[PDB]
Amino acid sequence: DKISHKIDIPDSAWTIGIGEKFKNAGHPNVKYPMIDDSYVQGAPLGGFGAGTIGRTYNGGFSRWHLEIGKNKYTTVYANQFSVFQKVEGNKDGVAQVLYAGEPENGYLSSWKWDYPKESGMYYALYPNSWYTYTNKDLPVQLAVKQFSPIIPYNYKETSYPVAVFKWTAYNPTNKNVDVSIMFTWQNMIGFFGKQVNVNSGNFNKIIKDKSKDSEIVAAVMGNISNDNEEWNGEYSIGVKKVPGVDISYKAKFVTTGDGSDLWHEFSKNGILDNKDDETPTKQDGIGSAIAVNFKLQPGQTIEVPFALSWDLPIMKFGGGDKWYKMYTKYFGKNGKNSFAILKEALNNYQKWEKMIDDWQKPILSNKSKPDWYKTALFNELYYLADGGTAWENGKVGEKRTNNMFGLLACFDYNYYETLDVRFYGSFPLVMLWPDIEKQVMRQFADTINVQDSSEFKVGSNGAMAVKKVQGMIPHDLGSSYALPWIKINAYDWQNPNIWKDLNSKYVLLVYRDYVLTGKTDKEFLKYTWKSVKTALDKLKEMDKDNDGIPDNEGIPDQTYDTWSMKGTSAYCGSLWLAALKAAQEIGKVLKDNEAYIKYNEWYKIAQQNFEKELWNGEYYNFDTESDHKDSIMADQLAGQWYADILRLGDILPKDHVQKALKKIYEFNVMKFENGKMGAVNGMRPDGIVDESDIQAQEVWTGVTYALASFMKYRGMTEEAYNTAYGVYKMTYDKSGKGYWFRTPEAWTKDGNYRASMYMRPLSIWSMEV
Ligand SMILES: OC[C@H]1O[C@@H](O[C@H]2[C@H](O)[C@@H](O)[C@H](O[C@H]3[C@H](O)[C@@H](O)[C@H](O)O[C@@H]3CO)O[C@@H]2CO)[C@H](O)[C@@H](O)[C@@H]1O
Numbered sequence: 001d002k003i004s005h006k007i008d009i010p011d012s013a014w015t016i017g018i019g020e021k022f023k024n025a026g027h028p029n030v031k032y033p034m035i036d037d038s039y040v041q042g043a044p045l046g047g048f049g050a051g052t053i054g055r056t057y058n059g060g061f062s063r064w065h066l067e068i069g070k071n072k073y074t075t076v077y078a079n080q081f082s083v084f085q086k087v088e089g090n091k092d093g094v095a096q097v098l099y100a101g102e103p104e105n106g107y108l109s110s111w112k113w114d115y116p117k118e119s120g121m122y123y124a125l126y127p128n129s130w131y132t133y134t135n136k137d138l139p140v141q142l143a144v145k146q147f148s149p150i151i152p153y154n155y156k157e158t159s160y161p162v163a164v165f166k167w168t169a170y171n172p173t174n175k176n177v178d179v180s181i182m183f184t185w186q187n188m189i190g191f192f193g194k195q196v197n198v199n200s201g202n203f204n205k206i207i208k209d210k211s212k213d214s215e216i217v218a219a220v221m222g223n224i225s226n227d228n229e230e231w232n233g234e235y236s237i238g239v240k241k242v243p244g245v246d247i248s249y250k251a252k253f254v255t256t257g258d259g260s261d262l263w264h265e266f267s268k269n270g271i272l273d274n275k276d277d278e279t280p281t282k283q284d285g286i287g288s289a290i291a292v293n294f295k296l297q298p299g300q301t302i303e304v305p306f307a308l309s310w311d312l313p314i315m316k317f318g319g320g321d322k323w324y325k326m327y328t329k330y331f332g333k334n335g336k337n338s339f340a341i342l343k344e345a346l347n348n349y350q351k352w353e354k355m356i357d358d359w360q361k362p363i364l365s366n367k368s369k370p371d372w373y374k375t376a377l378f379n380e381l382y383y384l385a386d387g388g389t390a391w392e393n394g395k396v397g398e399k400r401t402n403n404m405f406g407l408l409a410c411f412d413y414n415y416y417e418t419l420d421v422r423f424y425g426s427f428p429l430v431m432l433w434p435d436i437e438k439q440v441m442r443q444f445a446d447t448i449n450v451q452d453s454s455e456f457k458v459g460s461n462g463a464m465a466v467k468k469v470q471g472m473i474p475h476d477l478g479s480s481y482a483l484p485w486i487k488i489n490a491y492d493w494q495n496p497n498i499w500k501d502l503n504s505k506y507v508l509l510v511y512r513d514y515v516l517t518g519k520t521d522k523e524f525l526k527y528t529w530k531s532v533k534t535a536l537d538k539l540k541e542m543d544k545d546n547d548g549i550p551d552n553e554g555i556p557d558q559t560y561d562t563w564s565m566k567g568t569s570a571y572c573g574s575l576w577l578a579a580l581k582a583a584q585e586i587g588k589v590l591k592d593n594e595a596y597i598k599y600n601e602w603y604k605i606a607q608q609n610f611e612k613e614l615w616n617g618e619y620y621n622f623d624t625e626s627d628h629k630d631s632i633m634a635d636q637l638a639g640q641w642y643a644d645i646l647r648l649g650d651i652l653p654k655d656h657v658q659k660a661l662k663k664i665y666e667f668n669v670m671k672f673e674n675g676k677m678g679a680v681n682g683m684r685p686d687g688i689v690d691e692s693d694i695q696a697q698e699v700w701t702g703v704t705y706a707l708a709s710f711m712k713y714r715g716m717t718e719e720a721y722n723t724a725y726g727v728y729k730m731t732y733d734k735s736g737k738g739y740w741f742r743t744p745e746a747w748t749k750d751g752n753y754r755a756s757m758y759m760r761p762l763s764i765w766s767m768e769v
């Protein structure tokens with residue numbers, strides 16, 4: 001490997017061999033069907049709300065999130081980079097697709113597949129990833145840096161449906177070598193959203209944009225239809241000329257054929273026919289190819305940028321609503337703008353790289369933090385783009401000031417902005433994209449007094465319940481299968497209108513968003529204040545026995561939605577205390593004296609009773625009325641965790657908090673698989689895992705990262721990082737279970753998982769407050 005010195009890959013990048021087999025991979029641990037796309041994954045390309053494309057460590061474009069809210073894992077074999085090299089003096093050169101695999105059928109059989117093992121590495125530090133190619137049959141060593149412009153405090157480039165592939169080529173040998181790099185792409189219009197005639201009318205055109213000191217050559221892969229539908233738009237690939245490279249292209253090759261129409265050209269001398277051909281296809285799949293060819297002398301390096309864009313302006317959800325995607329603000333809505341997007345990227349990618357470096361540098365340059373922590377901190381952010389992210393710029397047909405936003409809990413449980421989850425998972429948004437965060441919270445504020453008296457069957461028990469109760473915060477803002485933002489509470493496993501955590505978490509999120517954006521946004525507090533008061537007042541009515549605390553009802557009535565709580569729980573009780581303290585402080589800021597007094601009075605009574613009921617001398621009991629009331633819960637002091645972040649002080653005595661956290665580390669971490677797998681949710685005081693429910697026997701990745709943050713704030717530095725380390729290890733390490741770029745909600749002691757591609761572990765960003 002002589003190419004690594006010519007590029008700049010951070011030491012904290014996650015690494016794997018191209019073509020590496022992983023032996024230890026985990027699988028779902030539930031009895032119902034659940035997504036398992038394998039460990040062949042990579043960092044995604046694409047902006048927020050753009051639809052994303054997962055290119056894996058083997059080189060394939062395989063995890064398709066272009067249909068917003070859906071996860072489709074299938075390798076589109078035509079989509080590749082390929083290389084040709086010929087040493088000056090030799091009769092023939094060699095050509096190789098840069099993909100460690102081959103197609104399942106006979107399409108593209110002429111291409112040279114099966115990029116060999118031990119011949120290159122993949123690296124990722126989101127939003128960047130890299131591949132190096134160090135192959136004994138390729139005298140010139142190559143590397144590519146690929147990324148999308150995901151940039152904190154930037155809501156423009158961050159939305160773009162574009163990727164840059166910045167290639168570096170170096171000749172360490174003593175002979176001249178002719179080199180070509182070719183990008184191939186299938187015209188994917190009709191890949192989704194088209195019920196019949198899936199390729200019909202697809203056509204490819206070539207754009208040559210020549211001005212002084214800029215030449216771009218691009219293929220635009222579209223359809224003859226000017227219809228404005230979810231399926232229609234354009235893909236583009238292209239390259240920018242640099243000194244010493246020539247560009248060649250082929251507008252149309254057949255993807256549903258042997259591929260020799262293209263490959264016979266490329267494999268000969270690395271130069272394509274430059275054949276334009278706009279003839280639309282009927283049944284056959286078609287694609288385009290863009291190549292560069294150059295000669296490298298001994299010791300010479302060259303850099304050349306390619307790009308990919310996709311202009312698919314309309315997202316459709318299963319309930320029938322069609323919305324424009326956010327990026328259409330910047331490029332238009334007609335779906336004929338892929339070239340404009342591509343050109344912006346090719347002309348500005350160097351600036352974007354520097355903007356990315358500028359945001360990563362403060363963390364990367366901090367030599368007190370271990371590399372593994374940096375690996376996790378950056379790579380967990382993949383989910384902000386990959387989580388079915390929806391970001392609208394108008395309903396099709398029907399303008400507003402604001403752009404509604406939603407991130408899925410996950411794909412298996414297809415619910416937008418699940419509030420009990422975002423309490424953990426929304427830290428990157430408040431810290432890095434706060435205008436999105438505040439918009440999402442205003443979305444929740446607007447739902448508080450919505451009433452929907454229609455009934456649904458509760459999954460856990462079969463009982464009928466009212467969809468949405470006035471004054472109760474919704475579980476979620478809908479499903480991609482139905483009507484995001486319009487029909488809330490798509491979740492039906494339990495009835496969220498009787499949950500004891502949603503209303504408190506809502507208030508805590510509101511105050512969090514004020515505190516972590518500088519305690520200056522009084523208008524945000526004003527917008528949400530009525531809903532905050534309503535939320536707390538409604539939750540107070542669920543206090544059955546006048547101890548000042550809402551009563552859990554002996555069913556799962558909170559985020560641990562198969563784990564029953566009864567009476568006063570440490571979890572919901574602490575959240576309630578913290579929410580009351582936050583509302584007191586908002587009351588002070590907004591000069592609402594009567595609210596301050598009321599919530600101060602409720603807080604004092606509740607605090608006193610919480611302590612009496614639950615403090616056992618070593619930790620806080622799980623609850624007051626369950627069979628396993630004395631279980632040690634990892635998340636027992638969640639309210640105090642948020643209180644630390646919100647600077648609300650001691651809701652519980654410092655001594656007791658420290659004892660409880662030490663107990664959790666000693667038991668839930670260190671007595672669970674030697675502390676190498678995170679914090680198990682429930683442990684009995686005899687040191688055996690609580691078996692009352694499956695969720696007690698799970699480590700929740702987001703709960704564990706949040707607990708690490710809590711320990712860190714409380715000065716338990718070793719415990720904090722050791723606790724978080726087990727989550728990193730299981731996700732990323734060779735000794736783990738292969739969950740990179742699909743971090744699950746949970747795993748059991750065997751390492752097998754529940755709900756890959758999950759929002760909650762974005763809580764690792766709470767470790768940076
Ligand atoms: O909907 C999201 C929630 O799902 C919970 O899992 C439940 C599944 O949604 C549900 O389909 C499954 O159904 C069981 C059924 O209860 C049982 O009687 C039958 O024999 O088998 C079905 C599965 O084939 O139940 C599970 C719970 O066990 C998650 O647990 C929850 O966290 C999530 O939010």
Ligand SMILES: [Ca+2]
Binds near residue numbers: 542543547548
């Ligand atoms: Ca009570």
